[PDB]
Structure 1
């Protein structure tokens, strides 16, 4: 019954997006005059105004919608549930002229991989939890997470969220950091700033940290806070590209194949932050950047740990709580990075964005993270729309 291949074989008549936007006809005005620069697969049939997946979009079928030239949304199909959790060789997916620079060299930290030095806990990521001792969260080493980004409210100045650097110019965070009506949150570009290269939360880091304005915010078109933070994803463009350093460097983004390889080889991923998730919940506390390694949870155990429906776009991490052992629920910075290291190409990849399940009033077992592995075609279409 379920729709396979992310809807690439689909031949039905669904012609509205998840958010009620009527699809435009594939042959239409700005669907033929400003929508042919993109390379489509001819085996897919672009019929009338029906949702289709002609570009191998891991997210699924989509269609053009009214708005600016190239505007589009995704459609609601019942995709088959997919268990993603099943020199330096890397090749660049995005156009550097719209992505900015940084992709070719992503996930190789100047102070670690580039000097053939291992950070203090990375070997832990590839080791089965022997039961026994756990390596607890501690202060990060200098340069350990040079893709770490802080999102601030401009006025009053206040740390709002974490985020992550994916190029010199683009940053990923959770949509609920920008738009969350339950907490009366509706931030536009001019309400915010970001600081990059930071280690200390409270000390100005002369010659190291960088501040930046945001030029543009793209909330994911599937974002729906109503149904358990569905597609809790946002992409933000820096008004001025940030200069790379020993302290500022982008993380890599994985496709489905790379995600599979990361979860097949690793036992654990890594969460870095200033405990902002725990703090903002209490609003709606470490002064130095923290790092903790957390085991990936088996999907059935994740499904059984919570009341809500856990979709295949979401995963749990943390140690299982016991009579003498608390878990790692609500770890990290809201919208912050959950990363994994590839033992195959030595590079770091973001695997999730810190989210929540029922939230910190009833999440007590594991933390919840939104998968990033489906995002590449979305990011591609967004950056090509924005232009250079």
Structure 2
């Protein structure tokens, strides 16, 4: 996250880290056994880390649970990034508490201008080497679909929205992939892509979760 602020320990209790030795993607806890992340975060040997604040230091609220299943959306298109969503099942249910909590799925799509919380342990600078430790947060509005298409002509699908700022310096960034965009207490987005990060006139592009609720429910039920 570039141009954001320190969240505070466990103030984003649905934020998880996908780990393979080291953190490599974010994700969102949607019930005690399931995490939502990006299809492009798919790889074998994932451990989910819940209750993290400082990702480098044990603070006492962590749960470390192996993934048992990783289910990429069956229409994920790695060429266009359409349908960039994955579900991960935990090998055992997480213990839910004030610091480890699920986030609700949306009941409708959010409108342009809706303010959202984006979070993660990604790079905090738009160029060069970052040294993140604690979870970072950014408040960012959903942009109009027309301004989104204007920023990325010929590249925005109906399963994406832009969120953030046109002026630069405030955005999600590398290492934030798969993490949450939450608006009014609902998970509306997944950190996906952009032209670099925090660049002028190139806001972040996010998977539009509201289009996947039935697929999410079906995948949970059948697995």
**So what's the TM-score if we normalise by structure 2?**
0.89
8 Å CA contact retained: 2:171, 2:198: no
* 2: CA distance, partners of 1:309 / 1:214: 32
1:383 CA drift (Å): 2.1
Aligned to 1:302: 148
1:162 CA drift (Å): 0.2
Q: How many residues align?
A: 218
* 2: CA distance, partners of 1:231 / 1:169: 22
- Secondary structure, counterpart of 2:31 in structure 1: coil
Rg (Cα) greater in structure: 1
- Secondary structure, counterpart of 1:377 in structure 2: helix
Aligned to 1:290: 136
Aligned to 1:193: 47
Aligned to 2:118: 271
Structure with more contact order per residue of length (Cα contacts < 8 Å, sep ≥ 6): 2
1:194 CA drift (Å): 1.0
| Among candidates 335, 338, 341, match of residue 178 of structure 2 | 335
8 Å CA contact retained: 2:197, 2:204: no
* 1: CA distance, partners of 2:218 / 2:146: 34
* 2: CA distance, partners of 1:289 / 1:327: 18
Alpha-carbon distance change, 277 to 351 in structure 1, aligned in 2, over 3 angstroms: farther
Aligned to 1:119: none
- Segments of 5+ residues of structure 1 without an aligned counterpart are 1-135, 179-186, 342-347
1:363 CA drift (Å): 6.0
Please show how residues 68-107 of structure 1 align to structure 2 within 5 Å: none
Matched, 1:366 2:206: no
Aligned to 1:355: 192
Aligned to 1:32: none
8 Å CA contact retained: 1:169, 1:242: yes
8 Å CA contact retained: 1:270, 1:338: yes
Aligned to 2:37: 173
Please show how residues 59-138 of structure 1 align to structure 2 within 5 Å: 137-138=4-5
Alpha-carbon distance change, 151 to 276 in structure 1, aligned in 2, over 3 angstroms: farther
- Secondary structure, counterpart of 1:373 in structure 2: helix
Alpha-carbon distance change, 361 to 243 in structure 1, aligned in 2, over 3 angstroms: closer
Matched, 1:383 2:184: no
